[PDB]
Design brief:
By secondary structure, this protein is mainly beta. 13% of the residues lie in helices and 36% in strands. Strand 10 and strand 11 form a beta hairpin. Bound molecules: fe (ii) ion and sodium ion (9 copies). One sodium ion binds next to loops. It is classed as oxidoreductase.
């Protein structure tokens, strides 16, 4: 439980394997460690594989079963759907640029427009936390000029979740696909 500053991304990953050695999760400690890692672009350039038309998800580490660690690359104007996190912890650390995070309440069964509960601006090196009990969220790169890169950790890992229609609150099941794994493009 002695948390040291991650010197490198590699160091971060090693520390993460220690924090997730057990069955439970100290959320505040994982968040503090993620925040303490100073983004060094050279260290994660291998995973920063962008697509022109939407954001990409690039697997960095499989966390020996307990978590997925991955890097998301957001072109100018790229955003996600409103989604849940499948009963997992979600950690989001900015490695480059800014993201807008918008929070939504779980919809009632009546068809209604989903209204924003709040929004915030995540900035370089900041780490945010989300879970289903906090709410639904959307993540967007609203920048016209700057690509964004984020580091995402999910525990337990999941490759399916729901997307929500902002107009109705209706949900559909969605399968997450990896654009690359361990620096290897995986079509
Ligand atoms: Fe998310
Ligand atoms: Na490294
Ligand atoms: Na560091
Ligand atoms: Na992209
Ligand atoms: Na997108
Ligand atoms: Na992807
Ligand atoms: Na940005
Ligand atoms: Na947003
Ligand atoms: Na959620
Ligand atoms: Na990768």
């Amino acid at each position: 439980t002695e948390l040291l500053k991650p010197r490198t991304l590699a160091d971060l990953i090693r520390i993460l394997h220690e924090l997730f050695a057990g069955d439970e999760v100290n959320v505040e400690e994982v968040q503090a460690v993620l925040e303490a890692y100073e983004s060094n672009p050279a260290e994660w350039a291998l995973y920063a594989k962008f697509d022109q038309y939407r954001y990409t998800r690039n697997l960095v580490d499989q966390g020996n079963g307990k978590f997925n660690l991955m890097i998301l690359c957001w072109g100018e104007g790229h955003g996600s759907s409103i989604h849940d996190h499948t009963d997992s912890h979600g950690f989001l650390k900015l490695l480059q640029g800014n993201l807008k995070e918008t929070l939504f309440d779980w919809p009632d069964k009546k068809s209604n427009e989903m209204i924003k509960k709040s929004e915030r601006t995540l900035r370089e090196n900041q780490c945010a936390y989300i879970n289903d009990s906090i709410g639904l969220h959307r993540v967007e790169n609203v920048s016209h000029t700057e690509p964004a890169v984020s580091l995402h950790l999910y525990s337990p890992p999941f490759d399916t979740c729901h997307a929500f229609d902002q107009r109705t609150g209706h949900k559909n099941k969605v399968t997450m696909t990896f654009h690359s794994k361990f620096g290897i493009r995986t079509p």
